[PDB]
Amino acid sequence: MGPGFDFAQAIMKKNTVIARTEKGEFTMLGVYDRVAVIPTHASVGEIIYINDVETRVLDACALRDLTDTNLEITIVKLDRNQKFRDIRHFLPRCEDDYNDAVLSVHTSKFPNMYIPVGQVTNYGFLNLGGTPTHRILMYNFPTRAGQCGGVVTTTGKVIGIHVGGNGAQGFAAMLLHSYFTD
């Protein structure tokens, strides 16, 4: 409808796949080469389904900060025959607040879904399903089951992936450029 949705659509059309684990179906953001991200509570194993095709996982790393606190981001390298468009230049370098964000989801339950969530706060610490978690972004939108792994964007930046909500607020794990240096 506007330039926020235009940026979000450009990311969804080229840089997302549908990932299925034993824990459900998730929006999965491809970042560069065969490297993608998913919420850690997806419990990625040796094998994952990518757009309903059996795919070997070459590597999976559940990120934690230097105090050994959960960040809720798992970085997966997929045994796929094709690379993602490199979008690392759209990742923020530092923790920050944002205006006018969009949350975009693409699954069997929620195809081509886009939500204008508005203002995004650097919330920081969250007890997420009982797990102390850092680098959480918060938006005042009543997000629901089916949205985990959804991409949070502003115009020109990919800032996070949706990992939970409390019925009134939604919560994303930050994406930082430093997670994806090679």
Curated annotation (Swiss-Prot):
Active site per the UniProt annotation: H41 (for protease 3c activity), E72 (for protease 3c activity), C148 (for protease 3c activity)
Domain Peptidase C3: 2-180
Recorded catalytic activity of this chain's protein: Selective cleavage of Gln-|-Gly bond in the poliovirus polyprotein. In other picornavirus reactions Glu may be substituted for Gln, and Ser or Thr for Gly
Subcellular location: Host cytoplasm
Summary of the function given for this chain in its UniProt record: Major viral protease that mediates proteolytic processing of the polyprotein. Cleaves host EIF5B, contributing to host translation shutoff. Also cleaves host PABPC1, contributing to host translation shutoff. Binds and inhibits host IFIH1/MDA5, thereby inhibiting the type-I IFN production and the establishment of the antiviral state. Cleaves host MAP3K7/TAK1, resulting in inhibition of TRAF6-triggered NF-kappa-B induction. Cleaves host TICAM1; this interaction allows the virus to disrupt host TLR3 signaling. Cleaves host IRF7, resulting in inhibition of type-I IFN production.
Record text on subunit structure and interactions: Interacts with host IFIH1/MDA5; this interaction inhibits host IFIH1.
This protein's name: Protease 3C
The organism of origin for this protein: Human enterovirus D68
Span covered, complete protein: 1549 to 1729 of 2188
